[PDB]
Fold this sequence. Notes:
Chain B: It comes from Homo sapiens (Human). The complex is a heterodimer of chains A (405) and B (79). By secondary structure, chain A is of the alpha/beta class. Chain A has 11 helices and 14 strands. The radius of gyration of chain A is 29 Å and the shape is globular. The two termini of chain A are 30 Å apart. By secondary structure, chain B is mostly helical. Chain B is built from 4 helices and no strands. The N and C termini of chain B lie far apart (50 Å). The structure holds adenosine-5'-diphosphate.
Amino acid sequence: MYIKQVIIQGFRSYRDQTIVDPFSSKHNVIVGRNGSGKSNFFYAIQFVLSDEFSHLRPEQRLALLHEGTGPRVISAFVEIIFDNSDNRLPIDKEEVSLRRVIGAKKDQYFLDKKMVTKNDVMNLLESAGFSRSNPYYIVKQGKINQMATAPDSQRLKLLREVAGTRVYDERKEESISLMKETEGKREKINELLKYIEERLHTLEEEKEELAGSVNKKALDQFVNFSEQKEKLIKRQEELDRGYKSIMELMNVLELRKYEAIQLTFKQVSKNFSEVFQKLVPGGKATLVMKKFTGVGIRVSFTGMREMQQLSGGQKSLVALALIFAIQKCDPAPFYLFDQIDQALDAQHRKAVSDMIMELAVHAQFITTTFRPELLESADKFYGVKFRNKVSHIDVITAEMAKDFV
Amino acid sequence: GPLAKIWLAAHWDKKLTKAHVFECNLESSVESIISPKVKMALRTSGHLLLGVVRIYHRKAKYLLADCNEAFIKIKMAFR
Ligand SMILES: Nc1ncnc2c1ncn2[C@@H]1O[C@H](COP(=O)(O)OP(=O)(O)O)[C@@H](O)[C@H]1O
């Protein structure tokens, strides 16, 4: 599963229909001058796929429409065409199109040209492994900062979300409510089977009464109704057995729940060290717990230090290292990185580039940069040009790319 | 796999046919979650739990429909 193609129209600086040349399944780098429209392009993709753009007040929706001279834009769409040869999307098609259309009072998704709800789109992407509780399939400089400057407490809450605490509590509550109304169905089933059973006893007495000496149709089909009753009884037994095994499952899960959270924490920290070691060959880093009340970062580039007491550039790299670790704990088929290398040393930008190079062997990356280190890990190159206050995207060469950085 | 069908029931349950619902052994599904081949995140278990409950609810729904219809059939045969 990956992003085959993006089409944009009417969206921020992309006034005209913009059919982006289909992406490579590895690393695609988008370059262009400041204010050419790189961020707007990422906005177009998060607009279709990201949970934070799912609920938009009218003013927020109108803010996405193109503003500029000429005829006034009053609708916009962004279409993402997925490659689905994976069948990672539960849609039996090799390509899947997801288009989001907005207007003055219109906000409408289309899955293969058929209206679907936002609830559908969310479920569809959850099916494929994109969890609302992982905010990191898309990484922007804001997210890196918000991570580098988070309280040890807010780190704890994040890892708990990723671990699944909110999801489990929600899934568990939904299940219990659904269990509870199923019990009413089961009761009605049992009353019905008893009514059927008394009808079969009546039929049997009526049949012996005539033999010793009620429409005939019922007497004719008595054996039929008795055979049918057993088929329903067998299915009723299966429900009874299913109720027991579900109650057992809920118990097992409530009891393993803390070891499950602790399992995820232990792996996130482990990847954190291996990721910082690869990025900063030499040093190493590690997480530590609170009074738990919070999760803390302690790191030494030297062959330990708290989070704040670090270079603002070093704070950026460590937080990014942690994001990579959270990603590896919960890997996804494609990643969108908006200028994640902005606040990094040149040495560290090449470290990140060398990492993506390896990661792009098994996942698609769509990234934007204003610096040239990431160009070495890229397989396709796109240039954004801004002319007449509208953005355009074209495929360019590796050589041309070293020219928009 | 077997849990792949439960996953579908959690998120995109419309892909599961009536035949799918009928065939699903909930008892071995649950044993697959309770004793996995590799330990799974609390989040995943929560999804799988809802999927199991969802298949179970659909079995009850179909069975209630069939019981109601069987009861109507029988008393219609009486007149
Ligand atoms: N709703 C909009 N309509 C038209 N142009 C917009 C809209 N929003 C932003 N822009 C313009 O698009 C340009 C910025 O695009 P942006 O993607 O942020 O630049 P960069 O390429 O540096 O990331 C600015 O000229 C900006 O004012």
